[PDB]
Amino acid sequence: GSSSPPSPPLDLHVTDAGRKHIAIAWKPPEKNGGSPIIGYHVEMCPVGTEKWMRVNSRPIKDLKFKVEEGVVPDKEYVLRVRAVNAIGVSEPSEISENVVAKD
């Protein structure tokens, strides 16, 4: 009965990882808040820090993403995803399981 950013993406999980990539997938927000979801953003943070960094250049128009930018081999990360609509940016998803950039 009002207009808001979307609720957060759901069910974020890691599908694959390597020394140079972390592949993730998620499910759409339960609610779009009153205007369609137009994109997703992925953030990455080395575990034990609060140094969240956006790892996509353009809005993601899919429910999966291969993270490559800024991945450091043998570092350990968590990820989170945000949804965007014409009102603004969602709070982030629940964070991912911990993932090491190794094979």
Author numbering: 1 to 103
Give me lines lifted from the publication on this model.
Titin is a protein expressed in the skeletal and cardiac, or striated, muscle of vertebrates that plays various roles in muscle structure and function. Encoded by the gene TTN, titin spans half a sarcomere (the basic contractile unit of muscle) and has various functions including preventing sarcomere over-extension (Gautel and Djinović-Carugo, 2016), acting as a molecular ruler for thick filament formation and as a hub for numerous signalling molecules (Kruger and Linke, 2011, Linke and Hamdani, 2014). Fn3 domains are only found in the A-band region of titin, where they are arranged with Ig domains in a pattern termed super-repeats, which themselves are repeated. Fn3 domains have a characteristic beta sandwich fold, with a core of hydrophobic residues as the “filling” between two beta sheets that pack against each other face-to-face.
Structural predictions of the three variant domains suggest little change to the backbone trace of the proteins and that no clashes would be introduced upon mutation. All domains with variants from HCM patients were solubly expressed in bacteria (data not shown), however Fn3-11 Ala16872Pro was unfolded as evidenced by 1D NMR and its decrease in elution volume (and increased hydrodynamic radius) compared to WT in size exclusion chromatography. We also characterised the effects of three further rare missense variants found in patients with HCM: Fn3-11 Ala16872Pro renders its domain unfolded (contrary to the predicted domain structure) but is still solubly expressed in bacteria, whilst Fn3-85 Ser27083Pro and Fn3-90 Arg27839Gln do not affect the folding of their domain but reduce its thermal stability. The negative effects of Ala16872Pro on Fn3-11 are easier to rationalise as it renders the domain unfolded, though soluble. For two variants identified in congenital myopathy patients, we have previously shown that missense variants that render the domain misfolded and insoluble when expressed in bacteria also do the same when expressed in cardiac and skeletal cells, giving no reason to suggest expressing Fn3-11Ala16872Pro in mammalian cells would “rescue” folding of the domain via chaperone-mediated folding.
